[PDB]
Amino acid sequence: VNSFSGYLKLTDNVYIKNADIVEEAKKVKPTVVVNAANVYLKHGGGVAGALNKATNNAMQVESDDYIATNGPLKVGGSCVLSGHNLAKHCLHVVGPNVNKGEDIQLLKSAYENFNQHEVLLAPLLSAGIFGADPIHSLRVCVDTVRTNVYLAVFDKNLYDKLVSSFL
Ligand SMILES: OC[C@@H]1[C@@H]2CC[C@@H](C2)N1c1ncnc2[nH]ccc12
């Protein structure tokens, strides 16, 4: 039993809700919140910019130190950093940017990072400025993640469409 509320069950282990991941994080304070990051951990907009703003830029300060030490992430890769005031930890995951020419097959690799954590609050990956159709992303999530994932879907029309879709 956990403190997530109002989620619609999609499979044994995947749950979905029309919600802003930032507000879900502030309310639930989960163990792991997933950020939809780029390889430079430059949190400008979308999920990343909104999460970072909610941390008063502390996420960006921590991220810049991480990059200065370790260099950029791989597309499809991840790192665990602090969750600041939003969660115990933040799992920064890089989905492929199809508008950068990056291989959509790397979306499966990106979701594989979720399997290292028993429970996560997460957005759909690659479905923002990275291009990728959200229907495909939800499908990859369901077919890749085996741990318990609570998906926060920002756009209501998109959520309704995802819920009403079989294939
Ligand atoms: O696929 C991620 C989606 C789409 C790309 C950016 C938006 C729409 N995003 C969000 N999802 C969940 N909580 C969010 N809070 C702020 C943005 C946001």
From Swiss-Prot:
Residues 1-167 form the Macro domain. It catalyses: Thiol-dependent hydrolysis of ester, thioester, amide, peptide and isopeptide bonds formed by the C-terminal Gly of ubiquitin (a 76-residue protein attached to proteins as an intracellular targeting signal). It is a multi-pass membrane protein. It is found in: Host endoplasmic reticulum membrane. Inhibited in vitro by GRL-0617. Changing T31A: In strain: Mu/B.1.621. It comes from the Viruses. Changing S164L: In strain: Gamma/P.1. May form homohexamers. Interacts with N protein. Responsible for the cleavages located at the N-terminus of the replicase polyprotein. Participates together with nsp4 in the assembly of virally-induced cytoplasmic double-membrane vesicles necessary for viral replication. Antagonizes innate immune induction of type I interferon by blocking the phosphorylation, dimerization and subsequent nuclear translocation of host IRF3. Also prevents host NF-kappa-B signaling. In addition, PL-PRO possesses a deubiquitinating/deISGylating activity and processes both 'Lys-48'- and 'Lys-63'-linked polyubiquitin chains from cellular substrates. This is Papain-like protease nsp3. It comes from Severe acute respiratory syndrome coronavirus 2. The gene is rep.
